[PDB]
Design a protein around this nucleic acid. Structure first.
Lengths: 92, 101, 90, 205, 20, 103, 19, 92, 105, 90, 102, 205
DNA sequence: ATCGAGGAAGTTCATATAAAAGGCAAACGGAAGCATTCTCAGAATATTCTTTGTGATGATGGAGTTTCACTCACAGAGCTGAACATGCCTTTTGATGGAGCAGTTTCCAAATACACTTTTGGTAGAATCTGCAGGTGGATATTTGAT
DNA sequence: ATCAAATATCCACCTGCAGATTCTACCAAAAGTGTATTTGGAAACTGCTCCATCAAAAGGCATGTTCAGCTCTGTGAGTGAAACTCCATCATCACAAAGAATATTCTGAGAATGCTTCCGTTTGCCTTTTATATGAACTTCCTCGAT
């Protein structure tokens, strides 16, 4: 009864390349990728919620875990297309 | 004659960088790892999962490649073209111990 | 090095199975145009000390959760703990 | 003195259940019960086995006596292992047989994993664990051969090291007083179930 | 009391030779 | 009545992150605005290297991504090399790189 | 699905100021 | 009004060198040292509680959290001396 | 009448304090009762390991107050305390006296 | 590094305060016998890129817990997360 | 007159500087450098730095550069030379890699 | 368009209290009030203040108009800063005084600090954000002067930037129709408390 | 050996910063006692998966010898880093200084755990159905070299 | 000055291993619905600690010029790795019955949480009170160079 992200990778791939497959060992990577960006982010937003001695991981503390972790130009778009998905979730 | 030996390294370096094997044979290497595991709390010959020895040879050989790819830059530095043990050891001295001991 | 063998003659060793033309073909992938002859006694020593920092950490994880079988997720953990995150098996 | 037999003795004792832990230790006959009174046999197991070996490694550290425990563990777990029956043919303490425990394999081991036990119904208890010319004997796959001095039938453990299966039968045939050894399909789970197929068919011929 | 672990010096880590 | 993921315009699961972000003990209390925003980032990264592996698969004249097409899709990109700095890829291979001082 | 500017491994380690 | 370990270090100094003092900026290291062997050890004995999916950090899960961290022959003495001070925690 | 934990164990580090810190940390949801008596026994050993070696760098420099530099000469001059403090710099640290043979004469 | 002054002449600049004999006294501590005359442009190129991978982490830790005062507890955290634990102040 | 060699030689200055532990870059020019990079990463809001933070960089920015010049100088003793070129500081940042300076 | 002027306006709107937010913005006279129908005035701040900059980043982005927002905030919270009063000597919507705003530091930048406030009773609120001939100006430590065209008294704000305090007594004095400035000890907190010491002692001489 | 004449280490110091010593009090926290909730060690059991062997079979590693490409020691010409010595500009100390900004404080409220119950979607898992890629050749077509 | 000829790309059928689409059902999970918990936003208020000037005071950097220690290229002497072919021995594939050992499900007793009442260890604040490490100076003596 083990679960994974492998349905969700294979739904994104049909959205940016409508005709390309992905082999079952490359899906074995994209699990152990997104089981690791998720652990670096929410394992370090847990640390800002202790330095400021708060108690709730809000959406604000995932923002300054992304602005530390992802370098370069990959941060200014992850924080861009991140908050676009929050100003949709609230106003609904 | 002994003047037409095919130029048989630059076909090789162009060959191996195009492919993605495991470069060391299994039963030589798999008898190496099963020896080192005996040196830690002797006696108990731990059984190994068969996918683990593929998981420790994709991580040895992708380190030794990036040691030879990285120690060779000192052989090009000193004017040589050949490697030497005075070149691999200076890769490990600069990498600044957590990478090599 | 735990051994109590004493006969003053033996087989190769056990490490003398990582052949010469493998350690060539590692280095040829690396871009090495031309190898020395003493690298073969070298890389058998660098490879031996690479495994005493993965097998020594993966045999602690397995001796903890009381088992005898060093699974695939242990060597992934003993490399993620070491600093070399592996993406094949996790 | 000895250190690396600890993981032989610490791992072995942990396999004994809590129902008969102290029954083995009184049957092993190595420790004085003046000391056994000290140990609290009520608390968690994993802390108990430290205090036992902290007595046992400070009384006598002994590989030749470490194997004798693991005879006794297989004495009270007879039902688990598959017991095979052999027979020799063409041929008292057997004290010459103790000195001639190993008339085989001289360049690796003078004695393999030498084990004896003085048990009635002619019962010797032999623990063999194999090891080659530079490989020390593997202390976690034994071989239990229970041969009786009168009946030619031996109760031999199914031992998962292969490449030693006729190596032991004839070297036991030479050192004992026999010349021919045969092998049967009497490879069962229980010993008393093998009594109705061997001792019924030999003592009532 | 306060016993000791063999504290040597740096040991020049980074050279590999078969133990002899 | 409605998946939360449809309400956000995402594809990664909102609640599965949220159930992991609670049962992981990262903090005693978890916001409700968070796992939208964490499942929105995790989309963008796995839509980023798969775009780059998508181009690298047509250039090798194949139509199915094998793991070598990720190793080339990271290492031939600047900002993903730094993110996946100390990370090896099984069945990965290396880049085609020759020393340029040979002949 | 827009883009950033994905360049190259885009040489460094010889770096100078923009002069 | 924050606390630290600057008392507890000092008694260890008077037990191995019965005469030597220790200056006040070189206590600030021995505090921020022992706030870092701690948060590595019990930052990682948290994680064997998660990989075996147990829930109690026992004394047993500090033992392999030591054997991973302290390298060399340093750990063979530390694990010898923790368990020395656990046998005489119970038998008191 | 059989008093406080740290004296009950024969330690010097506060066993009461660590059991609080294991609970405020959210390391796990339950913390066993043998745990901080093992964790504070370890930290007391390591602090009695530096200061035994950092006493000598005051002693061989003929001083009696351990400055930071007397720790730096004890962390970097031990094989295992090097590799444990692999990342760690020390403010007011200095460096070792490195003498390169080719620069010398 | 954006500036909007238009006069075609400036100061040292601002980085040229890490002088010539200061970069020497760094390297002389390291055991450098003898420097080139080109390190003095190189080392200021490195020290500009060392701070930008510390101040970009210090000025986010500050800006998160909403402040204007970049304390010493940020710059210890901006070096701890980075990979260089600093035992002076934290 | 009594001309020695090169203040004969350098070697007094090495063994005087490895002896001590003080700071090597002057505090006020370094305090102007840290307050100028901090104005770029902030979108203009000029931050006050604590007086303890501008010691907390300079104790690292020395003890990283001092380590880089040791770790580069093993290459100029490798190349047959003695003199340290930029070709070696450019190479010591390429052999640790991504963890000795991006 | 612009991005870095948003950091000035976001930081200022967060200083504006909840209870007087649309009291400012009617005087601020920039955002479309048909979209103020959509502008929430109820929920939490860090979501609300993103919604206003979203409407500033559609119409126009000029920092020269952004300084007027910091003026209206300082007009209504005059217990915040410590207040200062000067007087000039030896010598209306001020359109002759916009051309003669400040006749100095043209080689620094062309127009650096300039911000006006158009009010009756000559209540101009001249904002000066100082800066040298290389630096973009200090937009967060301003200088407010409330000087009147008829009465020679001014209400000068406190600015911790020194080296410009006589430089403002020279540049702004030639900017209006005067030649000499004096410095008094009228360093007060309130403006109406300064009315009883300046406008009492000048309009009733 | 001739020699002055530097440099270098030593105790000849006493001062002022930086420390051990002292007691509180009090805000804090850890210990004790006792009754109650719950993880998980022990144990017996179903069965996925690693060992160990046989045997082909052939793929490749081992062993030896040659000939050239490359490493090493030197030497001599041009340059370039260090010393030095003379002056000023820029660091640093210290004080007053507002004072901005942070720390602490007291509220109530929108956002949060929580629990139960409806369903959906994802979803994971098995079995079935198409399909890309490895593959060998049908080698025609090919460019580097030897006719 | 043109066949020789492995090399590369092509084309093509074709076996097959490995994705892709079905589907159930169902289990597990998430989602709407209320209802009670509680944090953290927000404002208010006092305070520590920061920027910013003036300013001696001098210490340390800068600019220029001279000279020896240095890197750079080239040459020949000579060693040492790629290449090759030749043959066997060690690694690989498959099946193998086989079974040690991992895994999943019960059960209850120790061990840990929670609460109150409790005593004491630990932080701070002066404040006193001792001291070790410091510069400057004393004076002997080692050691280094011009002869």
């Amino acid at each position: 009864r083990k679960e994974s992200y492998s349905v969700y990778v294979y739904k994104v791939l049909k959205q940016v390349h409508p005709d390309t497959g992905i082999s079952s060992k490359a899906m074995g990577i994209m699990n152990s990728f997104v089981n690791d960006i998720f652990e670096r982010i929410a394992g370090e937003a847990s640390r800002l919620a202790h330095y400021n001695k708060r108690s709730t991981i809000t959406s604000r503390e995932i923002q300054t875990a992304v602005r530390l972790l992802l370098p370069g130009e990959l941060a200014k778009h992850a924080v861009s297309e991140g908050t676009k998905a929050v100003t949709k979730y609230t106003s609904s | 004659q002994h003047s037409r030996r095919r130029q048989g390294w630059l076909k090789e370096i162009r060959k191996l960088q195009k492919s993605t094997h495991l470069l060391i044979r299994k039963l030589p290497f798999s008898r190496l790892a099963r020896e080192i595991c005996v040196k830690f709390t002797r006696g108990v010959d731990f059984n190994w999962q068969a996918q683990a020895l593929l998981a420790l040879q994709e991580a040895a050989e992708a380190f030794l490649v990036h040691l030879f790819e990285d120690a060779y830059l000192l052989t090009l530095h000193a004017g040589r073209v050949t490697l030497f043990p005075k070149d691999v050891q200076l890769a490990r001295r600069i990498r600044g111990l957590e990478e090599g001991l | 090095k735990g051994g109590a063998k004493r006969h003053r003659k033996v087989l190769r060793d056990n490490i003398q199975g990582i052949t010469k033309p493998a350690i060539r073909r590692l280095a040829r992938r690396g871009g090495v145009k031309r190898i020395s002859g003493l690298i073969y006694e070298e890389t058998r020593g660098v490879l031996k000390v690479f495994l005493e920092n993965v097998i020594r950490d993966a045999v602690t994880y397995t001796e903890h959760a009381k088992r005898k079988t060093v699974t695939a997720m242990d060597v992934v953990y003993a490399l993620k703990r070491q600093g070399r995150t592996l993406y094949g098996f996790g | 003195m000895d250190e690396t037999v600890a993981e032989f003795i610490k791992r072995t004792i942990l396999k004994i259940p809590m129902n008969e832990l102290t029954t083995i230790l009184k049957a092993w006959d190595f420790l004085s019960e003046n000391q056994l009174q000290t140990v609290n046999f009520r608390q968690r197991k994993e802390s108990v086995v430290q205090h036992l070996i902290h007595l046992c490694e400070e009384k006598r550290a002994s590989i030749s006596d470490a194997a004798l425990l693991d005879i006794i563990y297989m004495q009270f777990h007879q039902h688990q292992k598959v017991w095979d029956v052999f027979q020799m043919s063409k041929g008292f303490d057997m004290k010459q047989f103790k000195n001639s425990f190993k008339k085989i394999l001289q360049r690796a081991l003078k004695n393999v994993t030498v084990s004896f036990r003085e048990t009635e119904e002619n019962a010797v208890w032999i623990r063999i664990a194999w090891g080659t010319q530079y490989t020390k004997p593997n202390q976690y796959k034994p071989t239990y051969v229970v041969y009786y001095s009168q009946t030619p039938y031996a109760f031999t453990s199914s031992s998962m090291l292969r490449r030693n299966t006729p190596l032991l039968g004839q070297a036991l045939t030479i050192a004992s007083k026999h010349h021919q050894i045969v092998k049967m399909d009497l490879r069962s789970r229980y010993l008393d179930s093998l009594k109705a197929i061997v001792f019924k068919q030999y003592n009532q011929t | 009391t306060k016993s000791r672990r063999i504290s040597r010096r740096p040991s020049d880590w980074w050279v590999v030779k078969s133990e002899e | 009545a409605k998946s939360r993921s449809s309400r956000a315009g995402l594809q990664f699961p909102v609640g599965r992150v949220h159930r992991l972000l609670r049962k992981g003990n990262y903090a005693e209390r978890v916001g409700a605005g968070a796992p939208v925003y964490l499942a929105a980032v995790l989309e963008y990264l796995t839509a980023e290297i798969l775009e780059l592996a998508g181009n690298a698969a047509r250039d090798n004249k194949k139509t199915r991504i094998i793991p070598r097409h990720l190793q080339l899709a990271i290492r031939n990109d600047e900002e993903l090399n730094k993110l996946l700095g100390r990370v090896t890829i099984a069945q990965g291979g290396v880049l085609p790189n020759i020393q340029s001082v040979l002949l």
